[PDB]
Tab-separated table of C-alpha atoms in Angstrom:
chain	number	residue	atom	x	y	z
C	1	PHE	CA	-97.107	279.131	44.982
C	2	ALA	CA	-98.317	274.853	43.949
C	3	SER	CA	-93.752	274.578	44.119
C	4	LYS	CA	-90.697	275.729	42.710
C	5	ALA	CA	-91.401	277.762	39.265
C	6	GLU	CA	-93.803	279.166	40.367
C	7	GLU	CA	-93.425	281.115	42.190
C	8	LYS	CA	-89.528	281.539	40.068
C	9	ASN	CA	-91.933	282.628	37.292
C	10	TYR	CA	-94.012	284.942	39.217
C	11	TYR	CA	-91.005	286.786	40.639
C	12	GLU	CA	-89.005	287.236	37.254
C	13	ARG	CA	-92.195	288.016	35.085
C	14	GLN	CA	-95.131	290.194	37.462
C	15	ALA	CA	-93.668	291.302	40.947
C	16	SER	CA	-91.851	294.536	41.013
C	17	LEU	CA	-88.257	294.834	41.054
C	18	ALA	CA	-87.484	295.953	44.765
C	19	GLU	CA	-89.969	292.566	45.377
C	20	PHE	CA	-87.573	290.181	42.400
C	21	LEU	CA	-84.935	291.473	44.357
C	22	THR	CA	-85.376	291.250	47.681
C	23	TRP	CA	-86.844	287.057	46.839
C	24	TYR	CA	-83.419	286.017	45.393
C	25	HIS	CA	-81.065	287.056	47.814
C	26	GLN	CA	-83.141	284.725	50.077
C	27	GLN	CA	-82.140	281.850	47.000
C	28	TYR	CA	-76.514	278.654	39.554
C	29	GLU	CA	-72.643	277.674	41.305
C	30	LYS	CA	-70.407	280.500	41.155
C	31	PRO	CA	-66.518	280.273	40.512
C	32	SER	CA	-63.154	281.879	42.510
C	33	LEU	CA	-62.660	285.414	40.443
C	34	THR	CA	-58.612	285.772	40.041
C	35	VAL	CA	-56.468	287.773	37.892
C	36	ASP	CA	-53.336	287.222	36.421
C	37	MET	CA	-51.190	289.819	35.299
C	38	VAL	CA	-47.990	289.815	32.288
C	39	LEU	CA	-46.295	291.923	34.004
C	40	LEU	CA	-43.492	293.241	31.782
C	41	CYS	CA	-40.722	295.562	32.553
C	42	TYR	CA	-37.455	296.399	30.390
C	43	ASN	CA	-34.094	297.111	32.685
C	44	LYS	CA	-32.020	299.897	30.243
C	45	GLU	CA	-28.537	299.276	31.300
C	46	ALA	CA	-28.608	295.165	30.599
C	47	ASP	CA	-30.723	296.075	27.605
C	48	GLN	CA	-33.941	293.296	28.249
C	49	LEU	CA	-37.199	292.505	28.121
C	50	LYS	CA	-38.365	290.181	31.647
C	51	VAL	CA	-41.853	288.813	31.936
C	52	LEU	CA	-42.471	288.616	36.078
C	53	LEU	CA	-43.178	285.164	37.383
C	54	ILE	CA	-43.533	283.453	40.527
C	55	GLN	CA	-42.065	279.783	41.592
C	56	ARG	CA	-45.191	277.454	43.378
C	57	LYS	CA	-44.082	275.795	46.523
C	58	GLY	CA	-47.129	274.108	46.428
C	59	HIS	CA	-49.436	271.687	45.072
C	60	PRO	CA	-51.677	271.337	42.429
C	61	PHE	CA	-48.376	272.413	39.455
C	62	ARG	CA	-45.595	271.754	42.478
C	63	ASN	CA	-41.883	273.584	41.616
C	64	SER	CA	-44.226	275.196	37.749
C	65	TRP	CA	-43.601	278.710	37.346
C	66	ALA	CA	-46.332	281.264	37.283
C	67	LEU	CA	-47.902	284.613	37.057
C	68	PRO	CA	-48.612	287.251	39.539
C	69	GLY	CA	-51.618	288.022	40.083
C	70	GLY	CA	-54.511	287.630	42.718
C	71	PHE	CA	-58.266	286.950	44.503
C	72	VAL	CA	-60.959	289.954	42.471
C	73	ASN	CA	-62.490	291.189	45.819
C	74	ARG	CA	-66.762	292.097	45.780
C	75	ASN	CA	-66.104	296.336	45.680
C	76	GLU	CA	-63.391	295.646	43.123
C	77	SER	CA	-63.418	295.285	39.495
C	78	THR	CA	-60.129	293.414	37.295
C	79	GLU	CA	-58.755	296.234	36.920
C	80	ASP	CA	-58.930	297.873	41.219
C	81	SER	CA	-57.646	294.159	41.427
C	82	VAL	CA	-55.229	294.365	38.768
C	83	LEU	CA	-53.089	297.086	40.180
C	84	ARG	CA	-53.737	296.448	43.752
C	85	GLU	CA	-52.068	292.880	43.192
C	86	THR	CA	-49.379	294.594	41.124
C	87	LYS	CA	-48.427	297.190	44.505
C	88	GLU	CA	-48.170	293.766	46.728
C	89	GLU	CA	-46.403	292.262	44.336
C	90	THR	CA	-44.007	294.441	43.090
C	91	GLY	CA	-44.344	297.619	45.658
C	92	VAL	CA	-45.172	299.847	41.762
C	93	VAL	CA	-48.046	302.122	41.476
C	94	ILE	CA	-49.812	302.230	37.861
C	95	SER	CA	-52.301	303.127	36.059
C	96	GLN	CA	-55.148	301.890	34.003
C	97	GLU	CA	-53.299	303.550	31.374
C	98	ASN	CA	-50.485	301.220	32.467
C	99	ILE	CA	-52.937	297.951	31.628
C	100	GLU	CA	-54.651	296.182	29.292
C	101	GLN	CA	-58.222	293.152	29.797
C	102	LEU	CA	-56.293	290.351	27.426
C	103	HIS	CA	-58.493	287.684	27.923
C	104	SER	CA	-60.754	285.398	30.803
C	105	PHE	CA	-59.120	281.708	30.982
C	106	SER	CA	-62.334	279.567	32.132
C	107	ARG	CA	-61.825	276.109	31.046
C	108	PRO	CA	-63.641	274.228	34.078
C	109	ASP	CA	-60.719	272.286	35.500
C	110	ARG	CA	-58.136	275.097	34.867
C	111	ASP	CA	-57.493	274.743	37.977
C	112	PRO	CA	-57.868	271.259	40.031
C	113	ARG	CA	-58.812	272.243	42.816
C	114	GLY	CA	-61.856	274.094	42.712
C	115	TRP	CA	-63.701	276.170	39.618
C	116	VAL	CA	-61.819	279.163	39.201
C	117	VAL	CA	-61.830	281.119	36.337
C	118	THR	CA	-59.312	284.409	35.821
C	119	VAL	CA	-59.130	288.143	33.791
C	120	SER	CA	-55.662	288.641	32.329
C	121	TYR	CA	-53.827	291.347	31.729
C	122	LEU	CA	-51.127	292.988	29.832
C	123	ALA	CA	-49.447	295.379	32.224
C	124	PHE	CA	-46.001	297.462	31.202
C	125	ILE	CA	-44.069	298.606	34.360
C	126	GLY	CA	-40.983	301.208	33.479
C	127	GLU	CA	-37.226	300.154	34.857
C	128	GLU	CA	-37.208	296.842	36.611
C	129	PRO	CA	-38.099	297.273	40.224
C	130	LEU	CA	-36.090	295.071	42.724
C	131	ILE	CA	-36.722	292.729	44.389
C	132	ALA	CA	-35.568	292.022	48.109
C	133	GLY	CA	-34.507	288.274	48.542
C	134	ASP	CA	-36.557	286.279	50.632
C	135	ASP	CA	-36.496	281.884	51.108
C	136	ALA	CA	-40.049	281.720	51.527
C	137	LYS	CA	-40.386	283.199	47.908
C	138	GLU	CA	-38.832	281.720	44.763
C	139	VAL	CA	-39.982	284.843	42.073
C	140	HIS	CA	-37.248	286.307	40.113
C	141	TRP	CA	-37.592	288.715	36.580
C	142	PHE	CA	-37.105	286.770	34.043
C	143	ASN	CA	-35.359	287.490	30.937
C	144	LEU	CA	-37.486	287.010	27.227
C	145	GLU	CA	-36.685	286.720	24.097
C	146	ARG	CA	-37.559	285.342	20.744
C	147	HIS	CA	-35.885	283.027	18.763
C	148	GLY	CA	-38.778	282.339	15.063
C	149	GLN	CA	-42.329	281.406	16.618
C	150	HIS	CA	-40.341	280.248	19.910
C	151	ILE	CA	-40.428	282.608	23.010
C	152	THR	CA	-38.185	282.004	26.155
C	153	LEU	CA	-38.474	282.637	28.850
C	154	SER	CA	-34.986	282.298	32.312
C	155	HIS	CA	-33.862	282.839	34.905
C	156	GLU	CA	-30.571	280.869	35.831
C	157	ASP	CA	-30.519	277.625	34.417
C	158	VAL	CA	-34.719	278.110	34.107
C	159	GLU	CA	-35.352	277.669	31.092
C	160	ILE	CA	-39.127	278.213	29.987
C	161	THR	CA	-39.942	277.289	26.619
C	162	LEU	CA	-43.102	278.628	24.518
C	163	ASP	CA	-45.030	278.286	21.153
C	164	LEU	CA	-46.364	281.053	20.048
C	165	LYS	CA	-49.101	279.724	17.700
C	166	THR	CA	-50.073	276.729	20.375
C	167	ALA	CA	-49.201	277.273	23.144
C	168	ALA	CA	-47.312	274.403	24.343
C	169	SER	CA	-44.936	274.793	26.895
C	170	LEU	CA	-41.472	272.707	25.500
C	171	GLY	CA	-38.809	272.173	28.394
C	172	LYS	CA	-38.151	270.769	31.844
C	173	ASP	CA	-38.621	273.871	33.421
C	174	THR	CA	-43.041	274.342	33.751
C	175	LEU	CA	-45.795	277.444	33.866
C	176	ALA	CA	-48.219	276.697	36.460
C	177	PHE	CA	-52.375	275.606	34.688
C	178	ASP	CA	-52.950	277.167	31.745
C	179	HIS	CA	-49.925	280.456	32.492
C	180	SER	CA	-48.107	279.581	29.336
C	181	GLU	CA	-51.703	280.490	26.810
C	182	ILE	CA	-51.585	283.772	28.999
C	183	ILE	CA	-48.172	284.661	27.906
C	184	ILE	CA	-48.415	283.766	24.633
C	185	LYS	CA	-51.601	286.057	24.355
C	186	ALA	CA	-50.036	288.861	25.774
C	187	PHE	CA	-47.044	288.125	23.262
C	188	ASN	CA	-49.210	288.176	20.485
C	189	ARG	CA	-50.834	290.598	21.380
C	190	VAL	CA	-47.784	293.232	21.674
C	191	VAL	CA	-46.402	291.587	18.480
C	192	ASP	CA	-50.051	292.185	16.792
C	193	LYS	CA	-51.049	295.914	18.190
C	194	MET	CA	-47.760	297.532	18.565
C	195	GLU	CA	-47.014	298.825	14.947
C	196	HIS	CA	-50.015	301.243	15.490
C	197	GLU	CA	-50.243	301.644	19.366
C	198	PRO	CA	-47.427	301.363	20.996
C	199	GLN	CA	-48.187	300.620	24.780
C	200	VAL	CA	-45.792	298.816	25.241
C	201	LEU	CA	-43.044	301.127	25.252
C	202	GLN	CA	-44.159	301.584	28.326
C	203	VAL	CA	-41.608	299.727	29.080
C	204	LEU	CA	-38.542	302.417	29.110
C	205	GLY	CA	-40.450	304.255	31.559
C	206	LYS	CA	-41.303	308.556	30.984
C	207	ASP	CA	-39.068	308.926	28.771
C	208	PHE	CA	-37.525	307.167	25.264
C	209	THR	CA	-35.162	307.568	22.219
C	210	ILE	CA	-35.767	306.274	19.149
C	211	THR	CA	-33.109	303.428	19.100
C	212	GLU	CA	-34.022	302.676	22.398
C	213	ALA	CA	-37.755	302.345	20.740
C	214	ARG	CA	-35.878	299.664	17.889
C	215	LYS	CA	-34.238	297.742	20.260
C	216	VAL	CA	-37.835	296.963	21.947
C	217	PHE	CA	-39.562	296.227	19.234
C	218	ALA	CA	-35.993	294.183	17.845
C	219	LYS	CA	-37.074	291.740	21.206
C	220	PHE	CA	-41.116	291.322	20.560
C	221	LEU	CA	-40.297	290.665	16.526
C	222	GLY	CA	-37.474	287.950	17.296
C	223	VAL	CA	-34.371	290.086	14.955
C	224	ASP	CA	-31.215	291.596	16.174
C	225	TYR	CA	-32.286	295.484	16.747
C	226	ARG	CA	-29.806	296.619	14.119
C	227	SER	CA	-31.263	295.007	11.667
C	228	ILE	CA	-34.538	297.233	12.154
C	229	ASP	CA	-34.060	300.215	9.328
C	230	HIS	CA	-33.419	303.357	11.907
C	231	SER	CA	-35.251	305.955	9.209
C	232	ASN	CA	-37.949	304.047	8.540
C	233	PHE	CA	-39.133	303.097	11.886
C	234	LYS	CA	-38.757	306.990	12.478
C	235	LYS	CA	-40.987	307.345	10.447
C	236	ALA	CA	-43.797	304.931	10.188
C	237	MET	CA	-44.132	305.532	14.732
C	238	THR	CA	-42.648	308.944	15.115
C	239	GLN	CA	-47.076	309.330	14.351
C	240	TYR	CA	-47.852	307.988	18.399
C	241	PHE	CA	-44.880	310.086	20.870
C	242	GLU	CA	-44.690	313.606	21.464
C	243	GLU	CA	-41.316	315.252	21.443
C	244	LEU	CA	-40.432	316.126	25.227
C	245	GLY	CA	-36.032	317.309	24.662
C	246	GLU	CA	-32.906	315.535	24.920
C	247	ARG	CA	-23.638	314.854	22.781
C	248	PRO	CA	-27.607	315.427	23.483
C	249	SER	CA	-30.253	312.260	21.958
C	250	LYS	CA	-34.192	313.435	21.300
C	251	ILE	CA	-36.075	312.658	23.704
C	252	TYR	CA	-39.981	311.155	23.206
C	253	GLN	CA	-42.570	310.257	25.580
C	254	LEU	CA	-45.400	308.109	24.275
C	255	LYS	CA	-49.293	310.836	23.442
C	256	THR	CA	-52.448	310.063	24.183
W	1	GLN	CA	-50.324	261.058	60.359
W	2	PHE	CA	-50.478	264.594	61.861
W	3	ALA	CA	-49.259	266.284	64.710
W	4	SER	CA	-50.897	270.126	63.307
W	5	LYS	CA	-53.472	270.686	60.762
W	6	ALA	CA	-50.330	272.721	59.852
W	7	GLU	CA	-48.034	270.068	58.499
W	8	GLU	CA	-50.728	267.467	57.751
W	9	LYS	CA	-51.998	271.323	54.690
W	10	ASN	CA	-47.662	270.877	53.485
W	11	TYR	CA	-46.893	267.192	53.144
W	12	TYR	CA	-50.354	267.444	50.835
W	13	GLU	CA	-48.951	270.104	48.764
W	14	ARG	CA	-44.891	269.571	49.190
W	15	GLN	CA	-44.444	265.668	49.677
W	16	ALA	CA	-47.628	264.056	48.926
W	17	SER	CA	-47.795	263.778	45.140
W	18	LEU	CA	-50.518	265.239	42.702
W	19	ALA	CA	-53.212	262.455	42.901
W	20	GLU	CA	-52.398	262.676	46.627
W	21	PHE	CA	-52.605	265.996	46.798
W	22	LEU	CA	-55.909	266.197	45.361
W	23	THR	CA	-57.860	263.418	46.698
W	24	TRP	CA	-57.333	264.790	50.267
W	25	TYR	CA	-58.144	267.950	49.336
W	26	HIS	CA	-61.279	267.839	48.111
W	27	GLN	CA	-62.660	265.663	50.825
W	28	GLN	CA	-61.482	269.584	53.552
W	29	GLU	CA	-63.464	271.755	55.534
W	30	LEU	CA	-62.432	275.174	52.683
W	31	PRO	CA	-63.000	278.656	54.287
W	32	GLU	CA	-65.740	280.240	52.559
W	33	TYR	CA	-65.743	283.587	50.635
W	34	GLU	CA	-67.803	285.558	47.902
W	35	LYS	CA	-68.227	284.999	44.284
W	36	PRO	CA	-69.230	286.268	41.711
W	37	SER	CA	-71.898	285.121	38.986
W	38	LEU	CA	-70.476	284.259	35.981
W	39	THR	CA	-71.823	285.795	32.301
W	40	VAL	CA	-71.112	286.018	29.041
W	41	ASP	CA	-73.092	288.075	26.771
W	42	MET	CA	-72.825	287.781	23.070
W	43	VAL	CA	-73.388	291.271	20.011
W	44	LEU	CA	-74.010	289.595	17.048
W	45	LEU	CA	-73.176	291.936	14.288
W	46	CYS	CA	-74.480	291.917	11.189
W	47	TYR	CA	-74.438	293.113	7.150
W	48	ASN	CA	-77.357	293.110	4.915
W	49	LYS	CA	-76.464	294.530	1.099
W	50	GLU	CA	-79.673	295.651	-0.935
W	51	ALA	CA	-79.894	297.347	2.042
W	52	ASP	CA	-76.128	298.265	3.031
W	53	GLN	CA	-76.950	298.290	6.953
W	54	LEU	CA	-75.415	297.111	9.913
W	55	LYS	CA	-76.836	294.729	11.567
W	56	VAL	CA	-76.933	294.262	15.701
W	57	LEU	CA	-78.692	291.626	17.422
W	58	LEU	CA	-81.237	292.327	20.359
W	59	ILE	CA	-83.819	291.364	22.748
W	60	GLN	CA	-87.249	292.429	24.639
W	61	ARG	CA	-85.825	290.348	28.701
W	62	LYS	CA	-88.256	289.613	29.959
W	63	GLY	CA	-87.925	288.946	33.583
W	64	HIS	CA	-85.581	291.326	36.235
W	65	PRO	CA	-83.801	292.717	36.023
W	66	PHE	CA	-84.835	295.275	33.081
W	67	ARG	CA	-87.903	293.899	32.358
W	68	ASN	CA	-88.538	294.659	29.247
W	69	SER	CA	-85.441	296.528	28.786
W	70	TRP	CA	-83.624	295.510	25.465
W	71	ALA	CA	-80.750	293.530	25.691
W	72	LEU	CA	-77.715	291.448	24.305
W	73	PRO	CA	-79.151	287.426	24.948
W	74	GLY	CA	-76.538	285.939	27.316
W	75	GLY	CA	-77.039	284.129	30.391
W	76	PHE	CA	-75.229	282.400	33.732
W	77	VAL	CA	-72.140	280.564	32.723
W	78	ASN	CA	-72.944	276.948	34.134
W	79	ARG	CA	-70.469	275.309	36.229
W	80	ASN	CA	-68.720	272.082	34.093
W	81	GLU	CA	-68.854	274.836	31.082
W	82	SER	CA	-66.071	277.686	29.380
W	83	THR	CA	-67.342	281.024	28.674
W	84	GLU	CA	-66.517	280.220	25.286
W	85	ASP	CA	-69.044	276.789	25.334
W	86	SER	CA	-71.677	279.130	27.932
W	87	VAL	CA	-72.340	281.852	25.213
W	88	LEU	CA	-72.984	279.852	22.084
W	89	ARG	CA	-75.170	277.420	23.787
W	90	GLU	CA	-76.919	280.856	25.859
W	91	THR	CA	-77.398	282.484	21.887
W	92	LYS	CA	-78.956	279.765	20.319
W	93	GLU	CA	-81.407	278.631	23.696
W	94	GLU	CA	-82.271	283.141	23.442
W	95	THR	CA	-81.861	283.506	19.488
W	96	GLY	CA	-82.301	279.958	17.884
W	97	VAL	CA	-78.563	281.383	15.983
W	98	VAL	CA	-75.916	278.548	15.091
W	99	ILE	CA	-72.855	279.775	15.137
W	100	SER	CA	-69.638	278.192	15.848
W	101	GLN	CA	-65.864	278.430	18.546
W	102	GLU	CA	-63.720	279.005	15.143
W	103	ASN	CA	-66.414	282.369	14.428
W	104	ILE	CA	-66.147	284.201	17.771
W	105	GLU	CA	-63.989	286.137	19.878
W	106	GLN	CA	-64.177	287.797	23.111
W	107	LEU	CA	-64.434	290.675	23.734
W	108	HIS	CA	-64.289	292.530	26.977
W	109	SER	CA	-64.558	291.153	30.318
W	110	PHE	CA	-66.588	293.845	32.612
W	111	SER	CA	-66.782	293.268	36.625
W	112	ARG	CA	-67.552	296.887	37.156
W	113	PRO	CA	-68.452	296.085	41.188
W	114	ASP	CA	-72.212	297.816	40.726
W	115	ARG	CA	-72.842	296.743	36.505
W	116	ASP	CA	-76.203	293.879	37.749
W	117	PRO	CA	-78.613	295.129	40.295
W	118	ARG	CA	-78.872	290.509	41.417
W	119	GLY	CA	-75.621	292.042	43.689
W	120	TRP	CA	-71.765	290.394	41.651
W	121	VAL	CA	-72.317	289.961	38.657
W	122	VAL	CA	-68.650	289.699	35.735
W	123	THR	CA	-69.406	289.148	32.044
W	124	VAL	CA	-67.517	288.256	29.673
W	125	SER	CA	-68.433	290.039	26.170
W	126	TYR	CA	-68.020	288.315	23.361
W	127	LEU	CA	-68.942	288.908	19.222
W	128	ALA	CA	-69.284	287.311	16.652
W	129	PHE	CA	-70.178	288.759	12.634
W	130	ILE	CA	-72.720	286.355	11.099
W	131	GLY	CA	-75.789	285.830	8.090
W	132	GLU	CA	-78.732	287.511	8.736
W	133	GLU	CA	-80.144	284.560	10.483
W	134	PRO	CA	-84.105	283.692	11.229
W	135	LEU	CA	-84.453	284.577	14.088
W	136	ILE	CA	-86.785	282.648	17.463
W	137	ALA	CA	-86.836	283.784	20.434
W	138	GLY	CA	-86.243	281.677	23.760
W	139	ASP	CA	-88.707	281.188	27.241
W	140	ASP	CA	-87.003	284.730	28.400
W	141	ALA	CA	-86.994	287.134	25.964
W	142	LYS	CA	-90.397	288.477	24.748
W	143	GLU	CA	-89.419	289.654	21.049
W	144	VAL	CA	-85.885	288.915	19.159
W	145	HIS	CA	-85.353	290.975	16.104
W	146	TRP	CA	-81.632	292.593	13.930
W	147	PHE	CA	-81.763	296.046	14.996
W	148	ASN	CA	-80.697	298.190	12.362
W	149	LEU	CA	-77.450	299.870	13.684
W	150	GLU	CA	-75.667	302.920	11.745
W	151	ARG	CA	-73.141	305.120	12.890
W	152	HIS	CA	-73.345	309.342	12.727
W	153	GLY	CA	-70.594	311.172	13.978
W	154	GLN	CA	-69.120	309.555	17.088
W	155	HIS	CA	-72.396	308.338	18.250
W	156	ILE	CA	-74.373	304.957	16.634
W	157	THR	CA	-78.689	304.554	16.867
W	158	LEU	CA	-79.949	300.849	16.623
W	159	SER	CA	-83.201	301.033	15.571
W	160	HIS	CA	-86.260	298.343	15.375
W	161	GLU	CA	-89.611	299.316	14.799
W	162	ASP	CA	-90.185	302.339	17.529
W	163	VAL	CA	-87.831	301.276	19.466
W	164	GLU	CA	-84.797	304.019	19.314
W	165	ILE	CA	-81.034	303.786	21.560
W	166	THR	CA	-78.540	305.708	20.397
W	167	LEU	CA	-75.400	305.844	22.232
W	168	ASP	CA	-71.700	308.119	22.475
W	169	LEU	CA	-69.048	305.802	20.687
W	170	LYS	CA	-66.462	308.023	23.057
W	171	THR	CA	-68.912	308.060	26.650
W	172	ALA	CA	-71.342	305.402	26.065
W	173	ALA	CA	-73.967	307.402	26.979
W	174	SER	CA	-77.563	307.028	25.841
W	175	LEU	CA	-78.999	309.355	23.947
W	176	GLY	CA	-82.062	307.289	22.548
W	177	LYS	CA	-85.758	307.522	23.858
W	178	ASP	CA	-84.926	303.613	24.671
W	179	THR	CA	-82.039	303.367	27.024
W	180	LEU	CA	-79.791	299.407	27.295
W	181	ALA	CA	-80.181	296.932	30.154
W	182	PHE	CA	-77.970	296.240	32.641
W	183	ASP	CA	-74.119	297.828	31.206
W	184	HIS	CA	-74.844	296.654	27.578
W	185	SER	CA	-74.347	300.296	25.665
W	186	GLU	CA	-71.153	299.755	27.478
W	187	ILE	CA	-70.696	296.608	25.586
W	188	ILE	CA	-72.049	297.561	22.238
W	189	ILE	CA	-69.917	300.622	22.058
W	190	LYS	CA	-66.616	297.965	22.732
W	191	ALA	CA	-67.335	296.217	20.277
W	192	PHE	CA	-68.349	298.580	18.135
W	193	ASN	CA	-64.551	300.330	18.633
W	194	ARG	CA	-63.109	296.653	18.618
W	195	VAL	CA	-64.289	296.739	15.006
W	196	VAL	CA	-62.886	300.318	13.967
W	197	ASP	CA	-59.359	299.264	15.575
W	198	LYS	CA	-59.164	296.073	14.124
W	199	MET	CA	-60.509	295.719	10.272
W	200	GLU	CA	-57.598	298.054	8.604
W	201	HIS	CA	-54.734	295.562	9.622
W	202	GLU	CA	-57.560	292.570	11.172
W	203	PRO	CA	-60.312	292.699	8.880
W	204	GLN	CA	-62.035	289.905	10.168
W	205	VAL	CA	-65.745	291.906	10.319
W	206	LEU	CA	-65.203	290.917	6.499
W	207	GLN	CA	-67.268	287.938	7.816
W	208	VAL	CA	-70.237	289.294	7.794
W	209	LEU	CA	-70.551	289.560	4.233
W	210	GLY	CA	-70.435	286.024	3.344
W	211	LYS	CA	-67.119	284.079	2.239
W	212	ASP	CA	-66.483	286.248	-1.242
W	213	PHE	CA	-66.671	289.458	-1.870
W	214	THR	CA	-65.257	292.933	-4.369
W	215	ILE	CA	-63.782	295.404	-2.692
W	216	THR	CA	-66.451	298.247	-3.155
W	217	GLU	CA	-68.556	295.892	-1.089
W	218	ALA	CA	-65.401	295.757	1.159
W	219	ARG	CA	-65.150	299.424	1.167
W	220	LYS	CA	-69.056	299.964	1.848
W	221	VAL	CA	-68.862	297.699	5.408
W	222	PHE	CA	-65.816	299.858	6.032
W	223	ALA	CA	-67.789	303.090	5.620
W	224	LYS	CA	-70.958	301.897	7.640
W	225	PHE	CA	-68.360	301.372	10.486
W	226	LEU	CA	-66.173	304.730	9.714
W	227	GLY	CA	-69.435	306.627	9.328
W	228	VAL	CA	-68.929	307.898	5.751
W	229	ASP	CA	-69.909	307.635	2.422
W	230	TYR	CA	-67.800	304.239	1.153
W	231	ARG	CA	-67.252	307.216	-2.684
W	232	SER	CA	-64.680	308.727	-0.022
W	233	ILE	CA	-62.617	305.647	0.284
W	234	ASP	CA	-60.350	304.991	-3.306
W	235	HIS	CA	-60.739	302.094	-4.598
W	236	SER	CA	-57.784	302.300	-5.575
W	237	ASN	CA	-55.605	303.105	-2.754
W	238	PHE	CA	-58.234	300.657	-0.737
W	239	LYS	CA	-57.261	297.330	-2.873
W	240	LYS	CA	-53.765	297.743	-2.557
W	241	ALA	CA	-53.814	298.617	1.310
W	242	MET	CA	-56.150	295.536	1.784
W	243	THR	CA	-54.629	292.937	-0.250
W	244	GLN	CA	-52.431	291.478	1.997
W	245	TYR	CA	-55.849	289.872	3.794
W	246	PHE	CA	-57.751	288.840	0.420
W	247	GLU	CA	-58.047	285.829	-1.431
W	248	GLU	CA	-60.256	283.710	-2.995
W	249	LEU	CA	-61.082	284.126	-7.375
W	250	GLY	CA	-63.181	285.428	-9.934
W	251	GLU	CA	-64.575	287.191	-11.605
W	252	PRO	CA	-66.030	292.040	-14.734
W	253	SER	CA	-64.442	293.135	-11.297
W	254	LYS	CA	-62.766	290.561	-8.773
W	255	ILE	CA	-64.204	288.606	-5.714
W	256	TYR	CA	-62.140	287.796	-2.793
W	257	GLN	CA	-62.595	285.704	0.598
W	258	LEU	CA	-60.356	286.767	3.546
W	259	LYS	CA	-57.347	284.427	3.871
């Protein structure tokens, strides 16, 4: 060959596949590839919808809260990495039945250290898992609630407020990277899906009563659960449930 | 000054401003690890009214991997570009079609570790509903065509001339003469099922109808995705269930746009 491409043209257009791949491997820039997870649980005893956050110790975004997540390994899909990273983080075994790919975040400077693309996922964890204390990391299941077009993620005196329409983060307590966009994407995804695909009810664990399911919907709607008519709820939603069994209240499971 | 490597790095992470963090950070010898190539692929759907034909744009690849196979248009994202920017640039370079950001939606990212014979390659796919534009091949496309797309039960067929690609809507199994490059059969099935899943409560797909439409046209689009005769979708029940997403004006039947 007389130069660079060339060369490029012969291997792509005339050579055999094997011959192409050999030349290809012997030699565009590449991003770091990660996953981030909006892990949702429900605490039946507090009647609280919760989402996991970890404070960064830790420039960039020192003292901002971040979603859990991590690097995708070469031999796994991002779905595989979510199952692995969630187990590492929380100790809970989920399957892909428990996750939903949300959106890929790729603003070239989203991480100012270098080129990092993330594939974000919602995952429904069941009951709130315990965290054994560790001063090396600030990690809590934050209460999640909604008022009108805003959501609040709180833990003690930490209060994070997000606009569901703009993704704007409104208080002194902040989220890292583009995690506020990820979190509202996840919230709005559940809101727009749940009436006709209530996967979100897996936050109730292995079974649920209709009233429990109504409480979950109320949290995402930003209303008092007493204001959701129980009967019209039951009627609309029961085509998605399978009766398990049970003074004793009737229990259900999602069908699939 | 420092002392140890450990002391230096947490002074910059934990004490320094962001500013100095970031000035210090970019001058460091960063440990190396494997990274994927990042690509984008685009599912362009239109609808011909006279023909009652859903169509999907495919290109015939001129270079390896999958030389001469039909494929979605797509390509490598550059470091200084979001995937959104990149898919719009690749679609234009490869097909001649100009779409705006507001008119694409991200569909799904495919990351199966062996989906590309080049090695670790991850794709962010996109979906858009557009007119049946004139097409011009870019250099890497031997041909570019609007393929006829038809649903038959749980299968869809993409056809152009003697090319025939038939996909199973539940397994992405490929039953036809021709086989899509890469994992593009999975991507087309994902796009097709996403529209079926969304159109009843978010009818963005009616964009293929071009800014105004009757209830009969909307029914005909819905039936092409459902794989039924439009006449089996009651006009009066459809008018009532869907109007909430509609506008427009009149008229000796009514014209609507999406709102």
